[PDB]
Amino acid sequence: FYNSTWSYVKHTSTEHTSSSRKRSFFRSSSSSSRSYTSHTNEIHKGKSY
Amino acid sequence: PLEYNSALYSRIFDDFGTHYFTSGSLGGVYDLLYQFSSEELKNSGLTEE
Structure with missing residues (x-):
């Protein structure tokens, strides 16, 4: 027999x-938010008797 | 046969063999081979970046 088990998370x-705020008798505000997530889960099992 | 004929005698040793027991011992043979092989691996890995 062999019993094999792999488990991975990334x-x-x-x-x-x-x-960015600016003033020159004209007034301005500017703002940006960018978020990225990549999530990977793998589980692998082989069992032989 | 009364006259020597190799074949017809040889038959004798085919059927009854060549010797008999003048003495001996009777009993029993207990013959055991057991062989266990085992192998484990574990791996654990964690990164924080």
């Missing part, structure tokens, strides 16, 4: 944040 997140 968790990734990436984020971006931005702010």
Whole structure:
């Protein structure tokens, strides 16, 4: 007999944040938020008797 | 046959063999081979970045 078992998790997140305020008698605000997540889970089993 | 004829005698040893027991021992033979083989691997890995 052999009993074989693999288990894998990859968790990734990436984020971006931005702010930009300006004044020149005209006034402005500008802002951006970007978030990415990639998540992978694999489980593999082989059992022989 | 009364006259020697190799074949017809040889038959004798075919059927009854060549010897008989003048003495001996009777009983029983207990003959055992047991052989166990086992092998385990474990792997654990964690990264935080």
